[PDB]
From a paper:
Uropathogenic [name] strains use filamentous type 1 pili to adhere to and invade uroepithelial cells. The pilus consists of a flexible tip fibrillum, formed by the adhesin FimH and the subunits FimG and FimF. The pilus rod is a helical assembly of up to 3000 copies of the main subunit [name], terminated by a single copy of the subunit [name] that anchors the rod to the assembly platform FimD in the outer membrane. The assembly platform FimD in the outer membrane of uropathogenic [name] is the catalyst of type 1 pilus assembly.
To explore the structural implications of [name]-mediated termination of pilus assembly, we performed a FimD-catalyzed assembly reaction of pilus rods in vitro similar to the one for the FimDHGFAnC complex, except that excess FimICHis was also added at the end of the reaction. A 3D reconstruction of the FimDHGFAnICHis complex at 6.4 Å resolution was generated (Map XIV). Initial reconstructions showed poor resolution of both the pilus rod and the assembly platform. However, multi-body refinement with blush regularization in RELION-5.033,34 improved the resolution to 4.0 Å for the pilus rod (map XV) and 4.3 Å for the [name]-bound assembly platform (map XVI). This refinement also enabled analysis of rod flexibility relative to the [name]-terminated assembly platform. The resulting composite model shows that the [name]-terminated pilus rod sits on top of the assembly platform at an angle of about 48°, similar to that observed for the FimDHGFAnC complex. Despite a greater degree of motion in the [name]-bound state, the observed modes of pilus rod motion and its conformation remained highly similar to those in the complex with a terminal [name] subunit.
Author numbering:
A (entry chain I), H (entry chain E): 2 to 158
B (entry chain J), C (entry chain G), E (entry chain H), F (entry chain F), G (entry chain D), I (entry chain C): 2 to 159
D (entry chain K): 4 to 158
J (entry chain B): 2 to 19
The structure:
């Protein structure tokens, strides 16, 4: 009997012609690095512990393509330290001289130019997972404050 | 002492005379479906898998309303297929011959006109989670691109 | 001395006027079904083994009620099969013609309508546990892929 | 080479110990929906929803206690603690308003002279919580309800 | 050689000059309190059973600080009872006169103003765990409905 | 009688067109290694004792495939030391200069390339067990801290 | 002196107002039924060997309770065979058409609804032990596979 | 021939710089205390049956540490009962005025503050075992319900 | 009356399409080797005292199969010593450079590969017992500490 | 002939340097 206006719902997605499709929980995600003490990141080039995330693939036809690579794109911190994500947050109250570093499964940072892909990983006829790591890289003295970073990823087959 | 002007806050809500109120996180949600391979939607009629989304009702009183139904309003791709939802991502770059469906409880396509209501669901004296599915529909050859859609929903109580 | 903002915490609960309050572990749970062979799920009517899961009720009262029943509100995969859930994991990657059936303690399928309750279970003072099962069901020829399903359940106290 | 677009920048360079985070300058609070049955009685109040105001780069050396006052449009002289609805569309809900609660669950006077209860500041990022709820001053009527309120911060 | 955009990733952290750092999974945790009966919460001041959570501190350095204490900050229900958090859910559907309150390791309510700290815990040279309890406190006659509470904690090393 | 909203249940599984399926208790399991002494892990290239965990295969058909193998995928700690798991714990308070090694039933480290499968194992009609080991390997001077590694296993049937 | 984090420990238990205390070794005891051949399980009514497992009760007094009975609650495999427990193992690789049947001291089966109770046993001041049996009862042609059957049990005193 | 994604496997452990290492079988465990009677736990200060358990320490060397002890940390009932671990099961259906408490080999209740340590025990050149008991202490008229508790123990050498 | 929740129980078993069924006590057996002296295992090849266990087969049918063979699958310590079980006690404080050997009826060490069966044993109608012996085996020099292993066995009937 | 799986075997013991 009684009817009222409920609301609005938006749906998002992408239709791709690649060999594999990215999962809904992997297209857009957020991860927690956690608090990191400044004492560990005292001098330049220091490194803290690494937290782990992953990107999920689905319906990977090995006949079309057998290997998958991922390359990141973001904002570098300085000319020398190209492989560090700068802290993209509010203008006020943001930590400086320290960034987020992305580690490929081989334990080395990936270039942020957008053309350096990860090591080739083989796929299977079904769901697939490619692992990555996120840690803190100190380019100098670490200052207290928040640290939020955003970076996109591109897949090559 | 050192008083500083800040910013502004906008409260948005709706007063209704019905038997239930839609949840605050439910009135406006962004359901993300991830990516779709073109091989899944290569031919017309092929349907990809679905992602479930649910609408939450609060303070439902069964003494005045026994069941509830939800109708969806949106822009169909064409009169030939009135049970899909055309893409509304941007002016350029959108995919072609693809659209999203809003399946009801019985796993069937809903009519996107605001008139055809879904299968009635009985309520209880409390939270009622009404579920739905969203899946991509192929009207031909699925070209690469994006796929975003918007659909309003109206809640009936009988 | 040193003071640092740590973060925030959230608590989720439900105050109900029923006879038994659902346990925290049973409020939100993730049943693991492992993997099932496409050879074992070949044609319509096929059924693999069932994984058991139970719902726990705490602080039951015998004076106010004596029996308990549950009802699941899920998404029927087909109009001809209203007792089978439909997989909803992502737009691509889920299995086709395969669903998950929820069996009550009487070894019978439950139709997902929100009104057809399960078999009654006698209650006792204190803690009470109600068992169930979940299994895979085949509506045709299976297709390799993932299978994630969600369903809310409604509990009555006669 | 083709033309792109236009990008605007907004913000304030304030001389304070704490600066408001970019996510709190202009934010939207989805109250949800409220049934008229729970608001039919005059003076009845519905349940609240929570929104937070975030302060960044706080210096505990010069500032210790912080508070927030709200400026808005009240419904009536008698009910000065309620905020009237400023919805652009006509046919909005009648005899209803929104109240911004305090840290101690008390209605805030919307005149700009009454501030929130003092909250101790912490080095780095300090968050102060608040709630928004529906206040019915009479017979509620179905319709939309959009309201706006500015906040001024005192240290 | 198909190269396609996959998506985006966000990272959240807080670099601080503190004796110990909070775990990534402990900076923002959700606690499922299950359900509680209106019969149990009927009487004024009735306190239900408490569910336990924990804050995990890592990389502790006993040289710079040996005792750690935290204080919680939230929205109190009323000035009479300042040690009870207020429910923060949609504008309609939440319970009344019932709120989540926090207990330290000494079984006492924590005043929610950001200035009253819990009992100080001695830190080791490694991982430490600070336990806490959350329980439902009734300021009067309870009402059936959901209860979603949020709170913020403030770490202090002394 | 009185009815209330009980809760939500999720079901997770995967259908595979293979010779053998993986047990529900084996698709996602947690292995405890316990504390290890930095005195024993001080020297570079040291090795501690192993903890036994096994992968269960069910409903194997010998006709489809007579031999089975499993390979591991994870983040190598260093390029030169490719056969060692890295640390996947929080970003603070985690032991460095150490990692986790996976040992095949032949007592050899398994390369984490994702294409280096372990030694083949015979299959029999019914439930099968594939054992493995996990141990600590030091790439230098051991440091105090926690350790939480993770590895994705892919099974081959032939 | 070199103090480090050790770990955690969990305590589980229940408090009842009855005249007996159920022992921890019987609250969550596990029984092994061994293996059986499909030759002995070919038609309706075919049985196997029955192993012996006991339920222990201590701290009992004869002043309040003199008789004790045990009622098993579990998932019946079929409506007709209400006294046969099903196979709640992993979703694949389990047996088909074979169930677990719980016996009594007299020799009759026990219904798994929970309302019916077994034969009453006399108690004594101190420690009491109630024996039971478990066997295999095939409802038809037997199939190879695992079988992990779970069932709760309640104790009566009158 | 056929490749199929199986799943994920986690690992958990610690690398501590100490004389002895807590065994993986004792880092975390669940010990059932059975059921108890309100008649037994009727009055304040009552005591139910004690269930025994042990903590195992592997790789113990005596040239760096001779005596070892453990300390427990948990939530007490009140200010007047600081050696009784409280109950943490859910928001309903739990017992009242009764809590789990821990006893060392001597038979004394360990304070749950985390500072007081157990009786010092000598270390042997090999696997060592420290026994403990858990029991129910009633601070009043006990009530029917469940009782779950968690405690955190730390080792001093 | 005064029914209370006693607890829950589990039953583990397996139905096999074979000529023999293993004993319930035999399927899960824990053999203990006792404390040994390092001087007895100081040099490579030295073995400690050998203890004896057995596997019991019930309901053996001579017509279906008149022979019985067993193969043991486990983790080998080294590629050169593939007949020695690796130790799976823990990740620290486990005796190093030693393993356990399972001698068959004739005394020959059994390879851990799944294709290496023991000597064929004549089958008698009804219950049979097949004996095996467990002993230590030290390579190089033995070291103090615990040494525990694990291995599953496949029974072949011919 | 037919090959089927058996149970699990666990070994326990300790080595002492006395």
């Amino acid at each position: 009997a009684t009817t009222v206006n409920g609301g609005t719902v938006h749906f998002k997605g992408e239709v791709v012609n690649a060999a594999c499709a990215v999962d809904a929980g992997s297209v857009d995600q957020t991860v927690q690095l956690g608090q990191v003490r400044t004492a560990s990141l005292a001098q330049e080039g220091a490194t803290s512990s690494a937290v782990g995330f992953n990107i999920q693939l689905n319906d990977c036809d090995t006949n079309v393509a057998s290997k998958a690579a991922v390359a990141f794109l973001g904002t570098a911190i300085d000319a020398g330290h190209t492989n560090v994500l700068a802290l993209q947050s509010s203008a006020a109250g943001s930590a400086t001289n320290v960034g987020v570093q992305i580690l490929d499964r081989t334990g080395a940072a990936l270039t942020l130019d957008g053309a350096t892909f990860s090591s080739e990983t083989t796929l299977n006829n079904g769901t697939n997972t490619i692992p990555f790591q996120a840690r803190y890289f100190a380019t100098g003295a670490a200052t207290p404050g928040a640290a939020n970073a955003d970076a996109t990823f591109k897949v090559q087959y």
